[PDB]
Amino acid sequence: MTATLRDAVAADLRSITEIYRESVLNGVATYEETPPSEAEMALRFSTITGNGYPYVVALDERGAVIGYAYASAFRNRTAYRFLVEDSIYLSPEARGKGIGKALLSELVGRCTALGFRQMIAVIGGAHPSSIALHRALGFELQGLMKATGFKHGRWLDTAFMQRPLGEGTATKPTEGVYPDTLYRS
Amino acid sequence: MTATLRDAVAADLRSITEIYRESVLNGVATYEETPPSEAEMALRFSTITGNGYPYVVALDERGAVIGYAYASAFRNRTAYRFLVEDSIYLSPEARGKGIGKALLSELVGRCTALGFRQMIAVIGGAHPSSIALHRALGFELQGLMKATGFKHGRWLDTAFMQRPLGEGTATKPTEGVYPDTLYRS
Structure with missing residues (x-):
C-alpha cells in the first residue's frame, strides 16, 4: 500500500518522542x-x-503517526553544507509495510529539490535491514567502522552509506541560494 | 629532532587560534x-x-607553540564513548619535521592509557600527507566520502580512517571508570 506521509508539525512531537523512546x-x-x-x-x-x-x-489509516524521518547536517561546518544525513524511525508495528522506503524516498526527493548534493547514512549497529533499505534507494556502502559503539553490553559496528543527490559533484552549486546560504558567517 | 610536546594551557590560546585561523x-x-x-x-x-x-x-626551540592536537568525541552520544577522533594542526613552519607524527602518536598513547578503544580520523579533502601520517601509525582507511565538502571553489572528498586502541574490541570496558563515565545521563 502507498504510504501516507506529510510534514511533521508541533502536534506530532508526542508520538515522535514515543517512537524514538522505543528505539533508544x-x-x-x-x-x-x-x-x-x-x-x-x-x-x-x-x-x-x-x-x-x-x-x-x-501515518496509519486513522491519521496517527507511526514513523518519522528527517534530514539534517552530517556536521554543521560550512564546507559540509551540501551534504545531508538521513534519520528514519518506525514504530515496531509500522515495519514490513514499505514505510521506511517511502520515508527515505521523500527525504531523497526533498533534499534533491532543495539543492543538496550528497546524502549520507550512518547506520547504528550496521543493521542489515537498514543497510538494505538504503541500498534499495541507491545508497552504496562506503565503509564499516568496527566496534565503534557499545550498547546493550555489546560492541557495535557503524556502517556509512552514501548517495549523490541531483547534480552531485558534476556542477558547482549556485552561489547565494539555499543550501549555499547555510552555515555562513 | 625529537618533538617537544606538552599539555596545552590557556596561555597557548593565541598561538592555537592563529594556527587554526591559517588552516581555516x-x-x-x-x-x-x-x-x-x-x-x-x-x-x-x-x-x-x-x-x-x-x-x-x-613547541619550537624557543618554546613557542608551532602545532597542536587533541582528541574529542566523534559524536557525543553515549554508545560512542569509547571512540575518540583526532584533530591535528601544524603551522606552516612546523611541517616536514615529523611533528605531526609526534602529535598523533601522543594522542594514540594518551587515549590508550586513558582507556578508549577506537580512534577515528576524518580527514578533510582526503589530503594525502594526512592519510600517510595516519597510515604510518597504524590507521586503516575505512572509506572515502566523495564530494562531501565544498571549499576554495571545489568539491572535496573526506577520508575516514580508524585504529583500534589498547584492547580494542577484544574485552568489555571496565564499568564505572573513565571513559565509561562519559555521556551518561
Whole structure:
C-alpha cells in the first residue's frame, strides 16, 4: 500500500518522542542511551526545521503517526553544507509495510529539490535491514567502522552509506541560494 | 629532532587560534570557513579538556607553540564513548619535521592509557600527507566520502580512517571508570 506521509508539525512531537523512546531503549539504530524528553525532541525539531531541512511523518489509516524521518547536517561546518544525513524511525508495528522506503524516498526527493548534493547514512549497529533499505534507494556502502559503539553490553559496528543527490559533484552549486546560504558567517 | 610536546594551557590560546585561523583560511583540514575568535577557541578548549580528553601543543626551540592536537568525541552520544577522533594542526613552519607524527602518536598513547578503544580520523579533502601520517601509525582507511565538502571553489572528498586502541574490541570496558563515565545521563 502507498504510504501516507506529510510534514511533521508541533502536534506530532508526542508520538515522535514515543517512537524514538522505543528505539533508544530496544534498538541499535540510535546510540543515545537515555530517551530524550518530549521537550528535548521538540527543541531538536525546532532546530532541524529552522535550518530548512525536511521533517516528515508517516501515518496509519486513522491519521496517527507511526514513523518519522528527517534530514539534517552530517556536521554543521560550512564546507559540509551540501551534504545531508538521513534519520528514519518506525514504530515496531509500522515495519514490513514499505514505510521506511517511502520515508527515505521523500527525504531523497526533498533534499534533491532543495539543492543538496550528497546524502549520507550512518547506520547504528550496521543493521542489515537498514543497510538494505538504503541500498534499495541507491545508497552504496562506503565503509564499516568496527566496534565503534557499545550498547546493550555489546560492541557495535557503524556502517556509512552514501548517495549523490541531483547534480552531485558534476556542477558547482549556485552561489547565494539555499543550501549555499547555510552555515555562513 | 625529537618533538617537544606538552599539555596545552590557556596561555597557548593565541598561538592555537592563529594556527587554526591559517588552516581555516588556507587549508582543507577543517571545513570551517570563518576563523573562530580566541574566545570561541577558549570555549572549545575548555569543553574538550573538561571531558578529560588530551589537548597538547608542540613547541619550537624557543618554546613557542608551532602545532597542536587533541582528541574529542566523534559524536557525543553515549554508545560512542569509547571512540575518540583526532584533530591535528601544524603551522606552516612546523611541517616536514615529523611533528605531526609526534602529535598523533601522543594522542594514540594518551587515549590508550586513558582507556578508549577506537580512534577515528576524518580527514578533510582526503589530503594525502594526512592519510600517510595516519597510515604510518597504524590507521586503516575505512572509506572515502566523495564530494562531501565544498571549499576554495571545489568539491572535496573526506577520508575516514580508524585504529583500534589498547584492547580494542577484544574485552568489555571496565564499568564505572573513565571513559565509561562519559555521556551518561
